[PDB]
Amino acid sequence: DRYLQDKKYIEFYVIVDNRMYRYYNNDKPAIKIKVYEMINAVNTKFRPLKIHIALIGLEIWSNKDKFEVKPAASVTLKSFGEWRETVLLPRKRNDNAQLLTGIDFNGNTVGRAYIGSLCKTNESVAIVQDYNRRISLVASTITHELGHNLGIHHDKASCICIPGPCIMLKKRTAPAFQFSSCSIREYREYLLRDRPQCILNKPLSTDIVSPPICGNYFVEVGEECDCGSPQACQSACCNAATCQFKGAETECRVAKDDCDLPELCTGQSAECPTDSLQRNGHPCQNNQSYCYNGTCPTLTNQCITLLGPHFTVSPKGCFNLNMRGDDGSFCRMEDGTKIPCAAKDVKCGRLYCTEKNTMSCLIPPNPDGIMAEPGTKCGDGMVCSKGQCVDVQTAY
Ligand SMILES: *[C@@H]1O[C@H](CO[C@@H]2O[C@@H](C)[C@@H](O)[C@@H](O)[C@@H]2O)[C@@H](O[C@@H]2O[C@H](CO)[C@@H](O)[C@H](O)[C@H]2NC(C)=O)[C@H](O)[C@H]1NC(C)=O
Ligand SMILES: *[C@@H]1O[C@H](CO[C@H]2O[C@@H](C)[C@@H](O)[C@@H](O)[C@@H]2O)[C@@H](O[C@@H]2O[C@H](CO)[C@@H](O)[C@H](O)[C@H]2NC(C)=O)[C@H](O)[C@H]1NC(C)=O
Ligand SMILES: [Ca+2]
Ligand SMILES: [Ca+2]
Ligand SMILES: [Ca+2]
Ligand SMILES: [Zn+2]
DSSP states (O other), X not given: OOSTTSOEEEEEEEEEOHHHHHHTTTOHHHHHHHHHHHHHHHHHHHGGGTEEEEEEEEEEOSSOOSSOOOSSHHHXXXXXXXXXXXXXXXXXXXXXXXXXXXXXXXXXXXXXXXXXXXXXXXXXXXXXXXXXXOHXXXXXXXXHHHHHHTTOOXXXXXXXXXXXXXXXXXXXXXXXXXXXXXXXXXXXXXXXXXXXXXXXXXXXXXXXXXXXXTTSSSOOTTOXXXXXXXXXXXXXTEETTTTEEOOTTOEEEOOSSTTBOOEEOOSSOSSOOOXXXXXXXOEETTTTEEOBTTBOOOHHHXXXXXXXXXXXXXXXXXXXXXXXXXXXXXXXXXXXXXXXXXXXXXGGSBOOEEETTOOOOBOOOOSXXXXXXXXXXXXXXXXXXXXEEEETTSOO
16 A cells, blocks of 8 residues: 555754854845755655655744754754654644754764654654755755654665765765665655654645745645646646646647547646546447447457458348357357347347458357457447447447
């Protein structure tokens, strides 16, 4: 079962601590645009994992911190977890929170996270130092720490990735863009074993506090559809560049033949409508079929497929042999044992073929052998069904 398979979503809450606010020269606007750009970069790295980070809360501690932030990363992480559980969570629902801090952590530590703790009330939390002007680098630490919360440990010496480092390398000095196959595996297992429920619901576009981003695969305020870039877009009825529905004149799947219906964009959805077919019983090929499962079965075409372009259905009188019910000329019951045909049913029994314009009765040699296919027209307003010649409207 899946999971696994389904697009997942994290209702993500961010705190910018008072040290970071000071380090940003008290500039809220500059702080917010930085966090927006980092979150979008985190979503780009998480995309192959089918997990989208939806920003639904941002606090900037412009006056004072709400709990004590301390340079021992493990002590802050445990304090943040507790604050999240005891203070935030009763008032603001969220799957996971990160603290972005301007404190300088002990040693060369740049963040810390609990492992595989999505949805836990005390542990779904990570801390991250804003330790470089380059979001390319802080955003990788943000993705790496969240990587830890989603059950992934550090890459062992033998993972993977080309070119730049893997996101879960314990130590990087360049931006990281992809997870190792080993990270990908461990996450897939995390999900199977812990089955974190809270990452299954899709958040409302109106609860996202980050500005809309056209091309992030999540439909936000002022967007109708979002399928990524014009070149990646697999949605036939979305104009990727503008995140807008294509118009309803736009054909998206032409009728392949006459037992087919064309699809057009609806004008108010992103995907090409599923492939509807012409209705069963519908006349086709110049009044020669019925339609059946989007196909037009005919005795002549069955002769042609069996024996080739030089043949057609035999003249009508040949089919009367089938009233014999002997070893060559017969009908079959639904189960389907050999029976003589009733007179009305003869064209639904053994098939007879002839060379074009020649009046013979021949039988394509066949161990079974061959009878009219289901829905084959056997007379006007009639088609073969369970070895019998019957009316539309059964239909079907
Ligand atoms: C945070 O989460 C759980 C604590 O949940 C506890 O579950 C009960 C056992 C009970 O004692 C509750 O009051 C607690 O809140 C800790 O992980 C463990 O969870 C399982 C399942 O309940 C249990 O078998 C373990 O013994 C729990 N650990 C304990 C009680 O020592 C987890 O370690 C906690 N981490 C922090 C930092 O609080
Ligand atoms: C013609 O189709 C029907 C089922 O209707 C559609 O849906 C798909 C499952 C597929 O078969 C497609 O070609 C078709 O347009 C088949 O009839 C049976 O009906 C049930 C329920 O309606 C289906 O779930 C079954 O797959 C099928 N039963 C069995 C055991 O045969 C039908 O088989 C098919 N035409 C033939 C005879 O090949
Ligand atoms: Ca959720
Ligand atoms: Ca979007
Ligand atoms: Ca169609
Ligand atoms: Zn790590």
